[PDB]
Amino acid sequence: GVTFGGIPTMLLIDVSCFLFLILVFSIIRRRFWDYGRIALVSCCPWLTAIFRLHDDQILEWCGEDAIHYLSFQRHIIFLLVVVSFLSLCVILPVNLSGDLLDKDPYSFGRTTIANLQTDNDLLWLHTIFAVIYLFLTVGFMRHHTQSIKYKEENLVRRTLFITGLPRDARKETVESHFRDAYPTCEVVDVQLCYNVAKLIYLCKEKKKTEKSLTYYTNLQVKTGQRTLINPKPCGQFCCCEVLGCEWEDAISYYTRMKDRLLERITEEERHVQDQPLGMAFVTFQEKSMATYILKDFNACGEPQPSSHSRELYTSKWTVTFAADPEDICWKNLSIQGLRWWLQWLGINFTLFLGLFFLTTPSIILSTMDKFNVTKPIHALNNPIISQFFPTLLLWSFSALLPSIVYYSTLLESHWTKSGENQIMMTKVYIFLIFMVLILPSLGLTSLDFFFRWLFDKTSSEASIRLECVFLPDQGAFFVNYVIASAFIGNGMELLRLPGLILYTFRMIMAKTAADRRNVKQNQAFQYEFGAMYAWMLCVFTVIVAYSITCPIIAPFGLIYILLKHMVDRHNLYFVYLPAKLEKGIHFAAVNQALAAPILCLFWLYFFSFLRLGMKAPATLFTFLVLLLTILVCLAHTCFGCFKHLSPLNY
């Protein structure tokens, strides 16, 4: 646009959408069955509960994982404050002090690294600031890691989760082994695991039926008469008497349902003892001896046999440090061995095969156009559904692709919630870093095209795609992306429109008023750390990568992180029941945060390669910094994934 790269108009549109979303949420928060405060049922009260909520209140009402998440967000806020100061006060004047682009005062290109000549000997300032950004990111994330570790030392954990037991072991034999082979440890109790998933589900259904029964008994006794109900999907409505939907006594119906639940309960009680899960929860009297056994097993095989060794297949065990009882997924704890791995290689391999060729909405849409999918629509339908259907399709594809990557991890079974969240964070962040940042920056549309251009080796007339990175339209595109994530993205995260749709569908498809109450008290679910970390890290990566190339994205990134911190302080309390995950997802998020300074260094290395060329001083300096910061971080990942093998860690 003729204005500042479309930033004024797009910012006005996004802030208007944010205000409208705030208005809609303020209207619907308590009216839509307390959807905006759904975790509390499991003068703006919601707006003043994020500026008055202390950290001690959050530590109690949301867990220590929420505290770690909010401390990470606050550290990112401070880092972005420092980055915005440095950029806006040094790099932006330097970029504006250039004549390589048009002299229009209201021009976005003037505020980019492309405005400076190759012989200005001032791109050294940009490279030095890239190194400074890397150092600042490392320092702030190490401060956050120090904060996590002080809460990671005790953990009051003494239970060890052992898998690989034969389906013939007993508590007596397990205790006999742990006594005969390790005389210095005091075993409290061994809890063999059985396939208690259907049993738990039926127990929960029985409890819900019990609450419905007591509701319809208290109501009956207080009103002096019973209540008519119509058990059928969408049976509350259509008061006209029709066949199929009949009005039947509530007390008798709920009593029959409770009796059937009880018969299934006792049948599953009988049948659950015949399906051992080949696992055990051995809890010791001291974390010292628990860690001693953990070092004995996982740190090197097992160099201490016992009398009950062959009968237990001690060499086949996999002793872990266990997890919180409420983060263990007994529903999908029953898949082991070659399974969960055939499923992993059937889910994630299919996802990789699909995404490798259809990573972006652009390539997905262009495939449809080539295969004459949009031809029936675009035959002759007036200009409206011709210029608006393709853009409507691209937004939809964005959402759907992120969401499919997400669900391949809501699948994958993932025995523990902490294990599910860490893999989800890794998969979603890696996919987003390519769908959002790398491929659109380079002008590509899929990972197949990315690797075809790379050839896995520097060859041919390359380094032309490395100009779409620094055009004064890619920078404005990502500035507008950060603005949208700041206002539209955070407004939609506050509103939770798809969740509201599903909640309304569940409520309307409820048999009775008691059935409408069990939905309200069970709608709230644990906060999706990892799922939210990946999005936050993706936007942060965009901000940092384009913080020097275009020193205008920094204030908008600061605005985005402030608004996201507010929205997450709101959602962790009014919504999103507390989660008890292992303190490893936070470390993984800290490790994945360095990809943003790494990609900033990549951007500046690309610029140096384009202008000064290979073997130039600035280019070689940036390349050396990139190689060092990647090897240090890569060796930092091969350290964590192999730390338990070191006896020093124990």
Give the DSSP letter string of 549-561: TSTTHHHHHHHHH
CB 537, CB 458: distance < 8 Å: no
CB 306, CB 237: distance < 8 Å: no
CA atoms within 13 A on the CB side of 223: 10
Domain membership of residue 253 (yes or no) is: yes
Distance CA 286, CA 187 (A): 9
Examine the fold and report which residue of 321, 347, 378 is the final residue of a domain before the chain moves on: 321
Examine the fold and report which residue of 272, 287, 313 is the final residue of a domain before the chain moves on: 272
Other C-beta atoms closer than 10 Å to the C-beta of 23 total: 11
Examine the fold and report which residue of 232, 249, 272 is the final residue of a domain before the chain moves on: 272
Find tokens 């509530």 and name the residue: 250
Domain membership of residue 11 (yes or no) is: yes
Which tokens belong to 152? 């990671």
Which CB contacts under 8 angstroms, 24+ apart, belong to 346-355? 347/408, 347/411, 347/412, 348/408, 348/412, 348/427, 351/404, 351/405, 351/408, 355/401, 355/405, 355/431, 355/447
Q: Which amino acid is at 628?
A: L
| CATH number, position 302 | 3.30.70.330
Residues 555, 524 share a domain? yes
Distance CA 414, CA 521 (A): 25
Return all residues near 528 (Cβ < 8 A) that are at least 6 apart. Answer: 421, 424, 576
Residues 481, 454 share a domain? yes
Tell me the technique behind this structure: cryo-EM
Other C-beta atoms closer than 10 Å to the C-beta of 404 total: 13
Phi-psi region of 615 (alpha: psi -120 to 50; beta: other; left: phi over 0): left
Cα separation values, 512 from 32, 95, 168, 257, 506, Å: 17, 66, 46, 14, 12
Return all residues near 597 (Cβ < 8 A) that are at least 6 apart. Answer: 130, 133, 134, 137, 138, 544, 629
**3 state DSSP class of 281:** strand
Residues 626, 504 share a domain? yes
| Helix residue spans in 318-443 (DSSP H) | 341-358, 361-370, 384-387, 389-410, 417-432, 439-442
Residues 180, 116 share a domain? no
Quote the strand ranges of 78-214, DSSP E. Answer: 159-163, 187-194
Residues 437, 295 share a domain? no
Task: Look up the domain containing 235 and give its range.
Answer: 198-272
Cα separation values, 595 from 59, 112, 398, 590, 601, Å: 29, 22, 22, 10, 10
Residues 234, 284 share a domain? no
Other C-beta atoms closer than 10 Å to the C-beta of 263 total: 11
Domain membership of residue 391 (yes or no) is: no
Q: How many domains does the chain have?
A: 3
Distance CA 479, CA 483 (A): 6
Which tokens belong to 607? 């610029």
Which tokens belong to 476? 């404005």
Which tokens belong to 114? 């492309």
Cα separation values, 207 from 200, 214, 254, 500, Å: 11, 11, 12, 25
Find tokens 């080796």 and name the residue: 457
Exposed/middle/buried for residue 566 (C-beta within 10 Å: 0-12, 13-18, 19+): middle
Distance CA 324, CA 123 (A): 52
Phi first, then psi: what are they for 249, rounded to 5°? Answer: -60, 135
Please tell me what resolution, in angstroms, this structure has: 3.0
Domain membership of residue 581 (yes or no) is: yes
Q: Is the dihedral of CA 275, 348, 430, 391 positive or negative?
A: negative
Gapped junctions in the chain, after residues (C–N > 2.5 Å) = 42, 300
Domain membership of residue 104 (yes or no) is: yes
Residues 97, 236 share a domain? no
Closest to 485 (Cα-Cα) out of 572, 571, 528, 543? 543
Domain membership of residue 179 (yes or no) is: yes
Distance CA 446, CA 485 (A): 23
Residues 237, 118 share a domain? no
CB 148, CB 252: distance < 8 Å: no
Distance CA 60, CA 303 (A): 43
Return all residues near 289 (Cβ < 8 A) that are at least 6 apart. Answer: 182, 184, 185, 186
Other C-beta atoms closer than 10 Å to the C-beta of 310 total: 10
At CA 417, angle to CA 414 and CA 419, rounded to 5?
A: 55
Domain membership of residue 1 (yes or no) is: no
Q: Which residues of 509-538 are buried (b: 16+ CB within 10 A; e: fewer)?
A: ebbbebbebbebeebbebbbbbbbbbbbbb
Distance CA 35, CA 274 (A): 42
Distance CA 561, CA 549 (A): 20
Find the farthest-apart pair of alpha carbons in the chain and give their distance in angstroms, rounded.
92
Residues 267, 140 share a domain? no
Cα separation values, 323 from 125, 187, 226, Å: 48, 18, 47
Residues 469, 611 share a domain? yes
**3 state DSSP class of 319:** strand
Domain membership of residue 435 (yes or no) is: yes
Residues 183, 150 share a domain? no
Which tokens belong to 513? 């008023």
Residues 428, 574 share a domain? yes
**What is the total residue count of the chain?**
650
